[PDB]
Design a protein around this ligand. Structure first.
Ligand code: BCL
Ligand code: BCL
Ligand code: BCL
Ligand code: BCL
Ligand code: BCL
Ligand code: G2O
Ligand code: G2O
Ligand SMILES: CCCCCCCCCCCC(=O)OC[C@H]1O[C@H](OC(C)(C)CCC/C(C)=C/C=C/C(C)=C/C=C/C(C)=C/C=C/C=C(C)/C=C\C=C(C)\C=C\c2c(C)ccc(C)c2C)[C@H](O)[C@@H](O)[C@@H]1O
Ligand SMILES: CCCCCCCCCCCCCCCCCC(=O)OC[C@H](CO[C@@H]1O[C@H](CO)[C@H](O)[C@H](O)[C@H]1O)OC(=O)CCCCCCCCCCCCCCCCC
Ligand SMILES: CCCCCCCCCCCCCCCC(=O)OC[C@H](COP(=O)(O)OC[C@@H](O)CO)OC(=O)CCCCCCCCCCCCCCC
Ligand code: SF4
Ligand SMILES: [Ca+2]
Lengths: 358, 113, 667, 49, 61, 52, 52, 15
């Protein structure tokens, strides 16, 4: 049978606000394509302005996971701000723990996102541009204290490898993207350039030696890539005014996948143009990346999308059309919507635009 | 949650203890061969069954209007047909168990009466 | 030219319009114009009272056959027998005196009504000039009458309505004292405090004269403050007094129902059952198809009876036709429906004034409690929600009881009448207010509560959501016309949100709780829908519930029984047809079809214009107008409410038929 | 009840020519009742060669 | 009994149509929002937890 | 207060008694209270806003 | 057409001494009385007041 | 313009 149950709820906020409550559930009675099982994960994200006078927001993400009885944790805090329309700066720290091992890290990085063109013929003729090719120039400075003998071993092996081989710049991509991440890079249109290691030096920090490594890379996009084509959309710093939280996490085993993601954040609804609001165009990279992994089983889908508009807010051009309505609580279920849900769960890219305005 | 089903039952059992309590105050003479303990309870059960049946009909016909789809090609007419069958067979096994005869057992089918 | 048409359907549009049925709207009327209109209408009321008294003549003392009986006079005949102006006398000699008295009182009413109409006309024209003296009176500052107008009300005529309550109460004390002295002098009836005779009416008229005079003195020297009714008394005070009069009128209907059945009222109402009544339009002496006149004796085509020559109206007894309670029910239901309508109209006109003050910001500028309460937008929601919850509880409980009773009657699902709510009677502490207390009276009380709350829902929606509602507050909308029918299909539809449409819905909802009175006062066993029907067990109610009376029939079988007499007479039959005709035509204007009517009327206009050229000649410029949904709802509410209560009258005026013989169980 | 069917209808016609000729009349119509994998919908196209 | 039951049910179903044919859809919608606020008010500080359910009203179509 | 042809008073406070075509009347109630208030010494606002 | 007033207070100095254990409510401030007086003599009123 | 016809359609997914 392999029936895939899923309920999605989108509760928007009105006026100039673009916020939205997003809670989704998934219950798929199919084996996940994880070479290690069971893979139980807990993901918690938070962000709040630090000083909106210049754009700092303190975004904190905690990943807790237990994959084949291996407790994995990754906490990270960052102070990200848009220094320029095309440039972004960030600074923060974190820690990575796997079983008994745990190494803390602090970093400072700047990501500069360029678009290959800025023609206004496209802008004034394509009302909803989707594919926007470009290249992000990450410039990452990260310092990791070297306390454990394993930290010493990693640092010494890395510096010896960099000194030894001249192909470390391109062969790191094999290590950097473990397993099918490399194939995901190509299917999503991403391309990782050879990293430019600007120096790996260690200095005795507060309590011991700290591995400070300057490096940068330039990862491009054919248009599908979310981090480039929607650079100004994925980081709504201007329209953030209160703590925003997203709590994801899946409990997964050899015979099922259970997903429950909560949400509170701006950018759910973006102005489609001329006062017409819309649900933001679906981020394509998650769809295509779930693409290599959602096609392994044929599934029956009973997907329920419950979009709750604010008061006075009507809808226009729902495609697929909303199935039932309760004057705000628009509901998508069965018919063409379940077909679209199957399409996008198997990796589809088909558009489902919700153009709403009061 | 579960407090509703502890109140839908809780409200109903309140009616059971309230209709039964007022029968002993609204002084009435019951049926010739009946007991005053059960004669208000039967009326309460009928009343509650009426309300509950109306509510479940409303809920069911509202639910099988959001859940109904093109996938109900079969078992929508088959469920209707089996409902028709069970009604027709209850017309013979439960309601009016036999076709009417006289007390002796004779059948009268023409205008011989 | 497609624009000459456009300022033709831009003529009934429900923008702010003249609305001929608002020519006497209180906005364009002042205080003195209200006084004059009321005086002229009271003069016309005296005219029609004289007409009714004339219709009460049976012998015409100068010598002639008199008037046949009619409900207009039969509803007041017990009162005139009470006052000694008419008689339940079997002989012409004592009936010539009654005819002379009624003729004299009719002439007196004609004269007094003419004087009253002339005075109201002069108040209407602001012309308080005395033609005999040539002076002119001042409406704002007048001596009331003379020396009496100085010892009390020492000059200084009332300048404000709260200051006018007191002089009004003194005027009503004068009315009470005048009626008492009219009794004592003209009508005999000395004032004796014996509360079983009409003399008690004179005694209590003097008592109420004293009470009203003292109260008028107190309110003249200590005027009370409702505050806000002083400013827009045209609509605020008027609507408050309209709903007060509605409640007073419902109370008066209840008083009439209780009193007219008492032994003290026997020689006036119960004794109507010893009379024979010859009502207009009732079954007349029929004749065959070949009647050739030549009176004295019929030759060809013998009539139904050798008596009652030609087409005379056949007698009907007052005992089989329960004229006593027929007249009692007519009066009681008239006053009850008038009270319900006045309550609804008071709430509606108060909502009109209240929207008018919400639109100009005066709503927040009210200090009196009566608005500072409901200016909360949450106490509004809480009040409407608790009224709706109570209505839901009461209506669901009583309707499920009625449906279970009907099921147990018909034995649906193999039930039995012993499974019914025959045991559910009023408490013994509540059994004193009913005769033969049973499930019928319990159901009547709960149906009255449910219908009153159901109409109270729309009344509260008028009172609170005149300008805005929590739904329309959440939406970006506000109500600003009190008569607009809709804003459109937006949000799935916005039909009937104004206080006018809420008034219409209140009327339609009170139709049920008000016709439930007609069933009750006729004894029609509203405790179930099929009573007295010989189906399974409906004739076993009289035995299972130990009834003392035997009511007509259930809610549905009430249209079978006692319709045997509506059909038996030509006048009631044609009233039935006319009422049904008027009633279903309200569908043409309540059904969401106004635009279809407009489109079809455009088509008919083009047809008539074309039909006036292909066959006839000359321009056919006339175009068919369609009632807009505001006008459509007004006309539909009138058609519906009148159509149902032209036939509730038929239930009331066709007889009582509520015999006191409980039939035995079917066994 | 059954699984997600999502029927697809299509016909294809090929008419060849004889001898050394390699020509052929190809005629194809299709109808899939599935959402196209395009981020902008609806899409239309009219290709002339 | 059966024909009387059919009579009553037919009359009931018939007059219920007035609740939706009459120009009253907006009145029903306003009242249903009142019902929603009442059911959620009566379920929040007398019962507990949210009463997210809201009463639906048939659109004019 | 006789307004010109077509002009309408919006927010007369104290509220006017009877509108007649294009002329308005104030009498008794809050208007009498305001008249007494300004005769005795008050400076309470009685603004009559109006447009066309 | 009115004034609505709410006052809620909680403070020391509500009562003062008068000798020999006899305490009194503080003497009423002069300025508020003779300031409301020059604004509270414009309408004849029969005020009903209850003090607790 | 074929999109406009689909854009300007009433919800046809009713039960
Ligand atoms: C993911 C696609 C691109 C990418 C696109 C971006 C984008 C876009 C940005 C960065 C930014 C940064 N990247 Mg990068 N970057 C990638 C790969 C990398 C790698 C690596 C080893 O592969 C590294 C070290 C970095 C390093 C960095 C840091 C310099 C910096 C922010 C770190 C931080 O906040 O982490 C914290 C990590 C998380 C919060 C975990 C969750 C991450 C996911 C992507 C967030 C999902 C958000 C969710 C959809 C919405 C919930 C939001 C709620 C409001 C909280 N990037 C890949 C190639 N990178 C940021 C920057 O500009 O810095 C100047 C930035 O805006
Ligand atoms: C950018 C990624 C995050 C990070 C996330 C993780 C994750 C995730 C894991 C580790 C793990 C480990 N980390 Mg670490 N770790 C980072 C930075 C460091 C640094 C350093 C000098 O900066 C060191 C010495 C280490 C040390 C160690 C390894 C010894 C250890 C187990 C082997 C392995 O998987 O390595 C992983 C090696 C890397 C991800 C970065 C190694 C950096 C090297 C030493 C210096 C930078 C070289 C070059 C300039 C950067 C190339 C790009 C990166 C390879 C993406 N980490 C940065 C901050 N680290 C493992 C663990 O915790 O438990 C098993 C593991 O699964
Ligand atoms: C039952 C009596 C009716 C009534 C019936 C009449 C009639 C009839 C007449 C007047 C007339 C007048 N009435 Mg009057 N009038 C009534 C109540 C009032 C009230 C009031 C309630 O405030 C007022 C101000 C007036 C004022 C007036 C004066 C304009 C005028 C002569 C007064 C008089 O002679 O002494 N009437 C009472 C209620 N009145 C007389 C008039 O107008 O002469 C030109 C006239 O003919
Ligand atoms: C207009 C503002 C004055 C006022 C002064 C008067 C005067 C003066 C009279 C009435 C009159 C009536 N008032 Mg009033 N009325 C006010 C406040 C009220 C209130 C209330 C606050 O609840 C109520 C219920 C009523 C109700 C009523 C009816 C009982 C009565 C007859 C109305 C009719 O026939 O016409 N008034 C305020 C105090 N009212 C009439 C009445 O019956 O007086 C005995 C009458 O003559
Ligand atoms: C118990 C008597 C009822 C009453 C029953 C009627 C009836 C019935 C009628 C009027 C009519 C009128 N009444 Mg009255 N009327 C009452 C109390 C009032 C009050 C008030 C208390 O302030 C006011 C302002 C009015 C004002 C009015 C005018 C709308 C009109 C008289 C002038 C006209 O054109 O003729 N009535 C009391 C509440 N009134 C007549 C009219 O046209 O109303 C539209 C009319 O037919
Ligand atoms: C008494 C019953 C009815 C009619 C009689 C009638 C007449 C009528 N109706 Mg109707 N109607 C309903 C009842 C009646 N609608 C109901 C209950 C609904 C709700 C469902 C309803 C609804 C719609 C909609 C939606 C539309 C119309 C129309 C439309 C017009 C068509 C024009 C035509 O072809 O002539 C047909 C007209 C006639 C045959 C009239 C001839 C007189 C005859 C002798 C009957 C006498 C009339 C009456 C009984 C006597 C009273 C007279 C008085 C002096 C006491 C036409 C005037 C349409 C138009 O206006 O335009 C097309 C339109 O759109 N309706
Ligand atoms: C049987 C007939 C009717 C009701 C039952 C009723 C119930 C109702 N109506 Mg109605 N209605 C009309 C008939 C009925 N209106 C007509 C003929 C018109 C055209 C004139 C009409 C018009 C309006 C407008 C314009 C509005 C409403 C409302 C409003 C709500 C108010 C809330 C309330 O008092 O709860 C009280 C509600 C009850 C006590 C319901 C229980 C009853 C029983 C025990 C249940 C049986 C229900 C049914 C008979 C059988 C179904 C069982 C199944 C197995 C087959 C409330 C649910 C209003 C709202 O929506 O909310 C305020 C509103 O604005 N109406
Ligand atoms: C029945 C009519 C329809 C009602 C239902 C409304 C729904 C309309 C909305 C349309 C949409 C729809 O429905 O379909 C779509 C959805 O539908 C369902 O979702 C819900 C609607 C949330 C469930 C239904 C709620 C409940 C479970 C239903 C059952 C609740 C029942 C009705 C309980 C209420 C009982 C009433 C309130 C009685 C309460 C009365 C309280 C007592 C009597 C107080 C008086 C006694 C005291 C004062 C003393 C008396 C006394 C004494 C002793 C002596 C002397 C004296 C003088 C005195 C007065 C599915 O779950 C989804 O799948 C489906 O999508
Ligand atoms: C709102 C809250 C109202 C709560 C008040 C309780 C309601 C009580 C009603 C039952 C009273 C009753 O049956 O009276 C009991 C009395 C007499 O009671 C019995 O009645 C029988 C009628 O068949 C006979 O008259 C019997 O003699 C007598 O015993 O009935 C009347 O005569 C009452 C007069 C008519 C009542 C009109 C009510 C008006 C309400 C209008 C509402 C429309 C909306
Ligand atoms: C050649 C093409 C055809 C040309 C001729 C066709 C048109 C001829 C139609 C003529 C007759 C129309 C048929 C009837 C038309 C019909 O049935 O529809 C009702 C009709 C509304 O019609 P519309 O205006 O929508 O359209 C009718 C159109 O034909 C022209 O208006 O009028 C009413 O609402 C009646 C109420 C008037 C107001 C009275 C209110 C109540 C007053 C009191 C009465 C009751 C007492 C109280 C009791 C409760
Ligand atoms: S159906 Fe008629 S009354 Fe209702 S919203 Fe539409 S136009 Fe207005
Ligand atoms: Ca009767």
């Amino acid at each position: 049978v392999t029936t895939a149950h899923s309920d999605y709820e989108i509760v928007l906020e009105g006026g100039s606000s673009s916020w939205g409550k997003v809670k989704a559930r998934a219950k798929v009675n199919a084996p996940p394509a994880s070479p290690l099982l069971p893979a139980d994960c807990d993901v918690k994200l938070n962000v709040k302005p630090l000083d909106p006078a210049k754009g700092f927001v303190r975004i904190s993400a905690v990943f807790e996971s237990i994959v084949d009885s291996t407790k994995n944790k990754l906490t990270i805090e960052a102070d990200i701000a848009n220094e320029t329309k095309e440039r972004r700066i960030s600074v923060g720290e974190g820690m990575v723990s796997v079983g008994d091992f745990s190494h803390t890290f602090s970093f400072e990085g700047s990501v500069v996102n360029l678009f290959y063109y800025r023609s206004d013929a496209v802008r004034r003729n394509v009302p909803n541009p989707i594919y926007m090719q470009g290249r992000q120039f990450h410039d990452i400075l990260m310092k990791v204290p070297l306390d454990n003998n394993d930290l010493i071993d990693t640092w010494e092996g890395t510096v010896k490898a960099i000194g030894s081989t001249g192909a470390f710049n391109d062969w790191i991509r094999d290590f950097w993207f473990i397993g099918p991440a490399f194939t995901a890079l190509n299917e999503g249109g991403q391309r990782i350039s050879r990293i430019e290691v600007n120096g790996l030096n260690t200095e005795s920090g507060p309590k011991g030696p700290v591995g400070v490594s300057r490096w940068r890379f330039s990862h491009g996009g054919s248009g599908m890539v979310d981090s480039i084509s929607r650079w100004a959309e994925l980081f709504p710093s201007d329209k953030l005014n209160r703590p925003a939280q997203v709590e994801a996490g899946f409990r997964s085993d050899s015979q099922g996948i259970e997903v429950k993601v909560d949400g509170e954040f701006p950018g759910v609804s973006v102005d489609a143009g001329g006062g017409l609001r819309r649900i933001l165009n679906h981020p394509l990279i998650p769809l295509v990346h779930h693409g290599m992994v959602g096609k392994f089983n044929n599934f029956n889908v009973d997907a329920q999308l419950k979009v709750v508009l604010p008061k006075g807010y009507k809808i226009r051009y729902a495609a697929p059309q909303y199935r039932s309505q309760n004057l705000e609580e628009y509901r998508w279920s069965g018919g063409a919507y379940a077909r679209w849900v199957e399409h996008v769960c198997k990796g589809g890219v088909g558009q489902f635009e919700i153009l709403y305005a009061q | 949650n579960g407090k509703l089903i502890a109140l839908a039952v809780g409200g109903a059992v309140l009616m059971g203890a309230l209709f039964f309590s007022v029968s002993f105050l609204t002084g009435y003479i019951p049926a010739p061969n009946h007991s005053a303990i059960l004669t208000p309870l039967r009326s309460f059960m009928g009343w509650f069954l009426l309300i509950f049946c109306a509510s479940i009909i409303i809920m069911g016909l509202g639910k099988m209007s959001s859940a109904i789809s093109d996938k109900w090609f079969l078992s929508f007419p088959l469920s209707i047909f089996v409902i028709v069958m069970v009604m027709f067979l209850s017309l013979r096994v439960y309601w009016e168990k036999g076709r009417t005869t006289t007390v002796d057992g004779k059948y009268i089918r023409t205008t011989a009466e | 030219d497609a624009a000459k048409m456009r300022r033709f359907l831009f003529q009934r549009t429900e923008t702010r319009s003249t609305k001929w049925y608002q020519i006497f709207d209180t906005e364009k009327l002042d205080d003195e114009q209200v006084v004059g209109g009321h005086l002229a209408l009271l003069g016309v009321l005296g005219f029609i009272m004289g007409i009714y008294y004339i219709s009460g003549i049976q012998v015409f003392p100068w010598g002639a056959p008199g008037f046949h009986d009619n409900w207009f006079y039969l509803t007041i005949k017990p009162r005139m027998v009470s006052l000694g102006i008419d008689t339940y006398s079997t002989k012409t000699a004592d009936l010539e005196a009654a005819g002379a008295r009624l003729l004299g009182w009719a002439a007196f009413h004609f004269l007094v009504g003419s004087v009253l109409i002339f005075g109201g006309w002069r108040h209407w024209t602001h012309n308080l000039t005395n033609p005999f003296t040539g002076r002119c009176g001042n409406f704002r500052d007048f001596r009331f009458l003379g020396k009496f107008g100085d010892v009390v009300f020492n000059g200084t005529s009332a300048k404000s309505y709260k200051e006018a309550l007191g002089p009004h109460a003194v005027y009503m004390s004068l009315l009470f004292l005048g009626w008492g002295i009219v009794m004592w002098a003209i009508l005999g009836f000395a004032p004796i405090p014996d509360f079983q005779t009409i003399n008690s009416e004179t005694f209590m008229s003097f008592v109420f004269a004293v009470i009203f005079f003292a109260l008028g003195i107190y309110w003249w020297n200590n005027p009370p403050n409702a505050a806000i009714h002083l400013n827009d008394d045209m609509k605020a005070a008027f609507s408050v007094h309209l709903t007060a009069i509605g409640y007073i009128n419902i109370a008066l209907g209840c008083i009439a129902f209780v009193a007219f059945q008492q032994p003290s009222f026997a020689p006036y109402y119960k004794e109507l059952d010893k009379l024979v009544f010859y009502l207009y339009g009732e079954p007349f002496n029929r004749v065959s198809f070949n009647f050739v006149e030549q009176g004295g004796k019929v030759i060809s085509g013998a009539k139904e009876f050798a008596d009652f020559p030609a087409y005379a109206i056949l007698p009907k007894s007052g005992e089989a036709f329960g004229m006593a309670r027929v007249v009692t029910n007519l009066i009681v239901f008239n006053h009850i429906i008038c009270g319900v309508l006045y309550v609804f109209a008071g709430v509606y006109h108060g909502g009109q004034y209240l929207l008018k003050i919400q639109l100009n910001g005066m709503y927040n500028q009210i200090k009196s409690i009566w608005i500072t309460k409901g200016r909360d937008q949450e106490v509004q929601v809480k009040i409407l929600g608790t009224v709706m919850a109570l209505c839901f509880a009461t209506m669901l409980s009583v309707y499920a009881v009625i449906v279970w009773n009907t099921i147990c009657e018909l034995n649906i699902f193999g039930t039995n009448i012993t499974m019914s709510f025959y045991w559910l009677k009023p408490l013994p502490i509540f059994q004193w207010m009913f005769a033969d207390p049973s499930i019928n009276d319990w159901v009547m009380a709960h149906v009255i509560t449910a219908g009153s709350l159901f109409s109270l829902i729309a009344l509260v929606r008028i009172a609170f959501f005149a300008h805005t509602s929590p739904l329309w507050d959440d939406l970006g909308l506000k109500k600003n016309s009190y008569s607009f029918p809709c804003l459109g299909p937006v949000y799935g539809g916005t039909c009937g949100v104004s206080i006018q449409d809420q008034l219409w819905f209140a009327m339609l909802w009170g139709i049920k709780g008000l016709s439930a009175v007609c069933w009750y006062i006729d004894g029609a066993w509203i405790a179930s829908m099929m009573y007295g029907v010989p189906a399974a067990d409906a004739k076993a109610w009289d035995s299972i519930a130990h009834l003392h009376h035997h009511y007509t029939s259930g809610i549905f079988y009430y249209f079978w029984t006692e319709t045997v007499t509506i059909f038996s007479s030509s006048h009631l039959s044609t009233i039935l047809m006319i009422g049904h005709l008027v009633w279903f035509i309200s569908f043409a204007v309540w059904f969401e079809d106004r635009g279809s009517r407009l489109e079809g009327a455009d088509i008919q206009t083009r047809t008539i214009r074309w039909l006036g050229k292909k066959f006839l000649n000359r321009d056919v410029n006339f175009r068919f107008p369609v009632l807009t949904i505001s006008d459509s709802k007004l006309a539909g509410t009138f058609l519906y409410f009148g159509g149902t209560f032209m036939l509730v009258f038929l239930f009331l005026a066709n007889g009582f038929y509520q015999t006191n013989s409980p039939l035995p169980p079917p066994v | 009840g059954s699984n997600d069917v999502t029927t697809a209808h299509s016909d294809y016609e090929i008419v060849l020519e004889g001898g050394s000729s390699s020509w052929g009349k190809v005629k194809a119509r299709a109808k899939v009742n599935a959402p196209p994998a395009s981020p902008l919908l609806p899409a239309d196209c009219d290709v002339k060669l």
